[PDB]
């Protein structure tokens, strides 16, 4: 048995180049630079193997930030041009990320403003967006679809007889809940109304759906769990009761359903069985907003604070103070929390810092963004932008790419 062996030279020598390439594909950028300088044959393996292309492709596959940049910058066209092109591109991508991250930290952004031009009752209660469109629910009882690029209104959907309080859409349907106590299902392409669910006794304040199931919740203090075999075949599976006031928000995944209420509590339910699991106590007033993913629950309350929670043990991991009014909407991703308040202000929080109990509280709010003139009802964001909507009847796109 030999003591040492040049794997990267030896493998191509026997006609096994791909194994050598596969070993090197595990290197981070800086180690791939090192490998290039080990010797001429190592360089040839990385170069003939298009390792820089493979490294950029691995990032696009594993990091939505890199995926988003590949599409937004246009170099994604070259993925899936010599090796040296990708090697020279890689630092430009790094610098691009750095400038984007700096823009977030420093609040540097451009701003687009849609005036919804509501004739009577002003305000946009809810919204969801993609690269093509913004779907928005309005206090004038309609859903307006806006072109993400031209900001023009492409479709108005009518049928609800009260405000459109909540909405979500996927590749097939839009589902909306309303002050008129109904849930409606719309075709995302044509807007045709496909179904109406009569069940709740009071305004439908929130809903979520995914993978053939939906959860709805209501001012009537109940939660409804639905099985959706199709847009037109939707059956009630269970009603969850136990909250003592309006249920303002619901989220779920395959493990748990999570509901929060004016009664100051968050409740956790088993998705498979619909059995109550536990109550999260701690907020001193009603809870207005919430998002749940993995093990993390983030909630916003009339007590002006944000709380972070572990779903399994129910522990509150962090209290976020700083908002001066009711925290009315909140979202998070892998890096940030973004929250909106009744005073029109939006705050960006450092989520990693917030989940580290060593970090001081004053370092947790990264930026305050002040461009709405009324209560912020809903927002959604990603690596590059925030889309927010307000009682002031506007939708804002905050863009941190330039």
């Amino acid at each position: 048995s030999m003591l040492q062996r040049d794997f990267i030279t030896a493998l191509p020598a026997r006609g096994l180049d791909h194994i050598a390439e596969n070993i090197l594909s595990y290197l981070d950028a800086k180690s791939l630079c090192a490998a290039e300088l080990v010797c001429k044959e190592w360089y040839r393996v990385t170069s003939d193997g298009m390792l820089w292309k493979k490294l950029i492709e691995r990032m696009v596959r594993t990091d939505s930030l890199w995926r988003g940049l590949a599409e937004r910058r246009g170099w994604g066209q070259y993925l899936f041009p010599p090796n040296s092109f990708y090697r020279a591109l890689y630092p430009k991508i790094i610098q691009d990320i750095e400038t984007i991250e700096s823009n977030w930290r420093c609040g540097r952004h451009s701003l687009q403003r849609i005036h919804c031009r509501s004739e009577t009752s002003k305000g946009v209660y809810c919204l969801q967006y993609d690269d093509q469109k913004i779907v928005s629910g309005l206090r004038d009882n309609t859903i307006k679809i806006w072109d993400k690029n031209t900001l023009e209104c492409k479709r108005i959907l009518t049928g609800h007889t009260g405000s459109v309080l909540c909405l979500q859409y996927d590749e097939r349907v839009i589902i909306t809940g309303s002050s008129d106590s109904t849930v409606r299902v719309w075709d995302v392409n044509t807007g045709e109304m496909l179904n109406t669910l009569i069940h709740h006794c009071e305004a439908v304040l929130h809903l979520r759906f995914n993978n053939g199931m939906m959860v709805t919740c209501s001012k009537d203090r109940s939660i409804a769990v639905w099985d959706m075999a199709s847009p037109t075949d939707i059956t009630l599976r269970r009603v969850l009761v136990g909250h003592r006031a309006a249920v303002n928000v619901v989220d779920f995944d395959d493990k748990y359903i999570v509901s929060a209420s004016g009664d100051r509590t968050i409740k956790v339910w088993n998705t498979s069985t619909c059995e109550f699991v536990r109550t999260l106590n701690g907020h001193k007033r009603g809870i207005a907003c919430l998002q749940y993913r993995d093990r993390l629950v983030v909630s916003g309350s009339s007590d002006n604070t944000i709380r972070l929670w572990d779903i399994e043990c129910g522990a509150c991991l962090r209290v976020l103070e700083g908002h001066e009014e009711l925290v009315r909407c909140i979202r998070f991703d892998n890096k940030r929390i973004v929250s909106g308040a009744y005073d029109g202000k939006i705050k960006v929080w450092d989520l990693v810092a917030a989940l580290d109990p060593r970090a001081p509280a004053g370092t947790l709010c990264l930026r305050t963004l002040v461009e709405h003139s009324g209560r912020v009802f809903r927002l959604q964001f990603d690596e590059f932008q925030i889309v927010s909507s307000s009682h002031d009847d506007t939708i804002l796109i905050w863009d941190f790419l330039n």
Binding site: Y125, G162, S163, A246, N248, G262, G286
Partner: peptide, 10 residues
């Protein structure tokens, strides 16, 4: 405060 139909308490 009821000028927000999206949330409620009490």
């Amino acid at each position: 405060s009821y000028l927000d139909s999206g949330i409620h308490a009490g």
